[PDB]
Each structure stands twice: as structure tokens, then as C-alpha cells.
Amino acid sequence: DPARSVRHIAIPAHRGLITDRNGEPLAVSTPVTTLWANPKELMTAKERWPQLAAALGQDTKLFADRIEQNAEREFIYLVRGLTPEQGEGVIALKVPGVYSIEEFRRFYPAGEVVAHAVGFTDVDDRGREGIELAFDEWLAGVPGKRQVLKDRRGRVIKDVQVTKNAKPGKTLALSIDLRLQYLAHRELRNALLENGAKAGSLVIMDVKTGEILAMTNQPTYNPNNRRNLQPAAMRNRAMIDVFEPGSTVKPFSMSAALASGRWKPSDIVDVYPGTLQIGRYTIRDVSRNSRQLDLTGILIKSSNVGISKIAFDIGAESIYSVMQQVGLGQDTGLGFPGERVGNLPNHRKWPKAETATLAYGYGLSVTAIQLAHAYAALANDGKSVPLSMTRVDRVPDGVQVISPEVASTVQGMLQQVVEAQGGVFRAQVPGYHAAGKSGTARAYRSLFAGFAPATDPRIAMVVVIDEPSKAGYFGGLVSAPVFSKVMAGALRLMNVPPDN
Ligand SMILES: *C(=O)[C@](C)(CC(=C)O)NC(=O)OC(C)(C)C
């Protein structure tokens, strides 16, 4: 057993600050006090152990058994993450082999409000979830190195040389606007309990820059106190969970129709008697007191029969292509942990049943992020700007995925869906023209997807509410009023001029 030893040891680096887009702190590394011990030294001072046990709130017997069972080790933790006062209280006992060191611990000042986006670090300040993990290399910095001389008990007797200084991690500014994030968090929360709903997500996106301005989910958790949390509570559902978008994808079906050369908005479809058999299967409308509807009316009344007949005429392939081009069932490139691509199925032959289901948004699966990104492209005159979770100063070129005229026509139809008699009037945003589409999917999921202001769009938004429990479960009743409140608040905070 050696009389001395020499060891190159790590100098930990200070982890980078995560901020919102305006520099509001979301994740900050602050010094906590850690007490550790060298048992080989403790073993020389047993009369001090009970005083030490007491100061640590430990039973004297269990503490003594712990030191005895570790008699051959040079390192154990006593307690991690005290205040300096708490440290100095123990250090005042002057117990041999007991030492304090300051180490960095993440604090999350907004806690539950941004937990799913920001994620968290382990006790070693390593990014283990969300942005903390996705940008770990950026935030972590580079540990330094130094050479210590240790005596026969592994006690540090000299600092010989520093070979490398630590390099701190880098500041990261998210795209999130904490002001919009708090507004969404609170409104989605108020909505959940108003409808006795299980779970929900809300996404707000900048249609010009591709930036995620808000991303909230219920349920949530306090990342500063992760003791006894539900595993459900930690899911970033907006990126992690996939659902059938139902009627919210009808604007893409319609984009394919207006692009085909075969359809204009004042064209007519006969949807009487509100059902359509195709062999074994029957397509069914919620409301079944219509015969002739124009394409705008097909959206206002959300007629499954109407969108299905259009889809038969233009063919599923045209609709599939629009949905693929606006990013449905495609990688976002965000690289967020557990992030889902979902499923936009393909066929060589599209039979009539698959053709109809695709057109009204059954048999495909998307994330809330994806559905928001598609509404952003439609709102941005058919140009998709690539998605960002980080502040965008230099906006990359977007890709024209829907012709500008077709996008402009579908925008106007979606404004009528909100503004017209029989429309989703609860989605109306006071002072503004707004546009979007309600959806309901299967126990129900309640959807609203929209953008505003209609005259020069700035913001796309998706509200998803899981299993509302009141007699009203339609997207137009459950999700639309949340869209209204949050869209109103977000446009005021962003100083967007009233267009109505
Ligand atoms: C759209 O979401 C559709 C396809 C039509 C609509 C009500 O907006 N959803 C639908 O038909 O929902 C149920 C009634 C659950 C089938």
C-alpha cells in the first residue's frame, strides 16, 4: 500500500445560463455547499463521530457503521447541496477528514411554467432532459485539470500544477417568450379544470421566423423539487405525443383541391343526406341537414362527406403531397429528446375508404409542434420557415410548399370559419381578424388550430385538450375559447396592430 500518490483531477466548469428570447433566466447554475469525508482520516477521530452524526441529522449507530464499512475508501459524500451557513456549522466541529467544497446546482426560476421545454440536469449538472440535454455540449463548457499530491490516507498535501483552466459553458437564448409562456401555461391550466380534462398542450409559433414562442403542457411538474412526481407529469406532449388531427387537416385537403385546377371556393358539393357508404364503411357528418354546400361551407360545417367527394375527384396522392410538404409525419430537425415524427401513411393504390379518412384527418398521426408548423406555412402565404427552439436573429430562407395564391385563398376560408354565421365564433379575437379550424378525434380529443391577424399573419397556435369531461367535447367549444384568450394576449404583448 503506497506511502504517497499523484493524481490529475478535474476542475469543473460553470454551466451556461439558459434564457428566454429577451434574456429572462430559465436555467442558472448557482453554488451550493457539499460536505465530504476521507474515511481513512475519520477512522483516526472516532470520539468526534457522534457530534458529526448529530450535526448531519443521522443516528449515531448507522453513521458509525457507514464509516466503518468505508474504512478503506478515501472519499464519501456526507451531504450535497447545503447553504454556506449549514456547511460552516458542521465545519466548525473541526472534525478530522471532513471537508466542504462549493459545487454548481441548476435552479429553474420559472419552475413548472417552462419545465417540459427547458428540462433538467442531474446532481452532477449534466443535461438529462429537454433543452438541458439537447444542447448539453453547448451549455457544459470544458473542465480544467490539475495535479495533486496525496499522503498515505489519500489526503491532499500539495497543489503541484494546473495543466488546463476550466472553460465555462455558453449562454443559450431560447425562442420562447416567457411572457407568452406564462399566459399560455395559465390559460391551458384554467381550461383543463373548466372542462375537467386529463391533459393538454398549447403551441405558439412565429409564422415569419419559425420560432416556438410558447410550448406548454398539462400536467406539469416543478423541476426544482422532483421528489414524488407522476411519470406522466414530465412528458413534453407537444413534441413526444402523437394524435389523429381530424378536421384540423381539412385546410390542406382544400389546398390540394384549389391547386388541382378543378375547384374554386364558390364551387358546390351535394352532401345530402349527411352520410356516404363505400362498401362496408359509411362516412358520417355531425350535422346532416345540408344538400348543396360551397367549399367554404364544407369547412364551416366541417362536412366529412363534402371533403371526401372533393378527395375522390382530386385523388389522395395530391392531398398526401400537401400534408408531406407542410411537414406532417416528417422530422422537424429540432432534435428534442423523445421527439416524435408521427405517421403519414402511403399506399400504391389509394382506395376510397383510405382517400376519405386522409382528407378528414383519420389514419395519420402528428405532434402539436407539427400541426402548428403546418398552420405557420399556410399563414406565411404558403412558405414554411424551418422550426427553431432557439432565438433566430438571421432567419433562414423558407421553402414555398403551397402556392401563395392558394395559401391566401385558404386563409380567407379559415377567417370565414371563425367569422361567418354557423362558424367557430368562440375563436374570435377581440380587435383582430383571426382564422382557423376546430377538430374532434377519438373518450375525445378537442383541437383548435389557427393564426392571426388574418390581414398580415404573425402567430400560429394549436390548442389540444385530452378527454374533456363535460357534455361539450367539440374543439369549437373546448379549445376555441383558449385560442381566443391566448391569441389576444400574445398579439397585445407583441404590439401587433389591431386589424379589425
Ligand atoms: C373533425 O374533427 C371531424 C372529422 C368533423 C368535426 C366535428 O369537426 N370530427 C368528427 O367528426 O368528430 C367525431 C364526431 C368525434 C367523429
Author numbering: 48 to 489, 502 to 559
What's the publication's text?
The cell wall plays a pivotal role in controlling the shape and integrity of the cell and inhibition of the PBPs leads to cell lysis due to turgor pressure.
Due to this imminent need for new antibiotic leads, our DOS library was screened against P. aeruginosa PBP3 using the XChem platform. The core enol lactone scaffold was found to react with Ser294, the catalytic residue found within the conserved SXXK motif of the β-lactam binding pocket. In addition to the covalent bond, hydrogen bonding interactions were observed with neighbouring residues Asn351, Ser349 and Thr487. Considering these findings, it was proposed that the identified hit could be rapidly diversified through four primary vectors to comprehensively probe the PBP3 binding pocket. The 10 elaborated analogues were then screened using X-ray crystallography to validate the initial hit and observe the effects of vector derivatisation on the PBP3 binding preference. All compounds except for 8–11 were identified as PBP3 binders using this method. This preliminary data proved to be extremely useful in validating this hit with all analogues covalently binding to Ser294 in a similar fashion to that of 1, whilst the specificity for the 5-membered lactone and terminal alkene could be inferred. The hit identified against PBP3 binds through a covalent mechanism, exemplifying the utility of our library towards the discovery of novel covalent ligands, in addition to reversible binders. Indeed, similar electrophilic fragments have been demonstrated to have enhanced utility in probe development due to their high duration of action and potency.
